[PDB]
């Protein structure tokens, strides 16, 4: 599949038994989600963005299904205005920019 | 070209006669640059991001070269840890996501 950039590139994920919408974000090194409930131990981290830094929990080896592809990676859970899928997962599904 | 996402997708732009590097950012909407000086009248605006909000100058109809493709769009000038090309210009150069 190929997605143009005339509207936000939003896809559907499954993670932790929950379904969410999330933004394909080539401007993000990492994947950040709000209001997902993940099991197990995590570590605290802080991420920066435009306009500031936010405190998050880091979960490793979280299985995630992104547009019907199954991948596994680190998922940050914390206050984000929109769910974001970053490069750490986009590489897993083979996603590229083309022009 | 084709750009994989194993490293940040950074391109070289030319804008207002100056050269800059910028991150191709599919999670943006808008283009924001840090230290350029564009001629003419602007409008003040606030943009939102992950950690908060920033106050910027909106310039319209700014010519810009993005990997040799010549494009005209709105560019926002203000506080940002990295220059960012958003969907507004990326649609002009034909950029898409592929997987």
């Amino acid at each position: 599949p190929q997605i143009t950039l005339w509207k936000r590139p939003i896809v559907t994920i499954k993670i932790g038994g929950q379904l969410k919408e999330a933004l394909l974000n080539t401007g993000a090194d990492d994947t950040v989600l709000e209001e997902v409930n993940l099991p197990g131990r995590w570590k605290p981290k802080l991420i920066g963005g435009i306009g500031g830094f936010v405190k998050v929990r880091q979960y490793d080896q979280v299985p995630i299904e992104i547009c019907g592809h199954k991948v596994i990676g680190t998922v940050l859970v914390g206050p984000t205005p929109t769910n974001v899928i970053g490069r750490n997962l986009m590489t897993q599904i083979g996603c590229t920019l083309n022009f | 070209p084709q750009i994989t996402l194993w490293k940040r997708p950074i391109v070289t732009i030319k804008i207002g006669g100056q050269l800059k590097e910028a991150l191709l950012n599919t999670g943006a909407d808008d283009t924001v640059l840090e230290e350029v000086n564009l001629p003419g009248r602007w409008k003040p605006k606030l943009i939102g991001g992950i950690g908060g909000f920033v106050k910027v100058r909106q310039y319209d109809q700014v010519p810009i070269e993005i990997c040799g493709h010549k494009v005209i769009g709105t560019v926002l000038v203000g506080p940002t840890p990295t220059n960012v090309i958003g969907r507004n210009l990326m649609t002009q150069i034909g950029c898409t996501l592929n997987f």
């Binding site: 090194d29 991420i47 | 950012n25 992950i50 840890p81 958003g86």
Partner: peptide, 6 residues
């Protein structure tokens, strides 16, 4: 509108 690094 606009989205992240550690």
């Amino acid at each position: 509108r606009v989205x992240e690094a550690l």
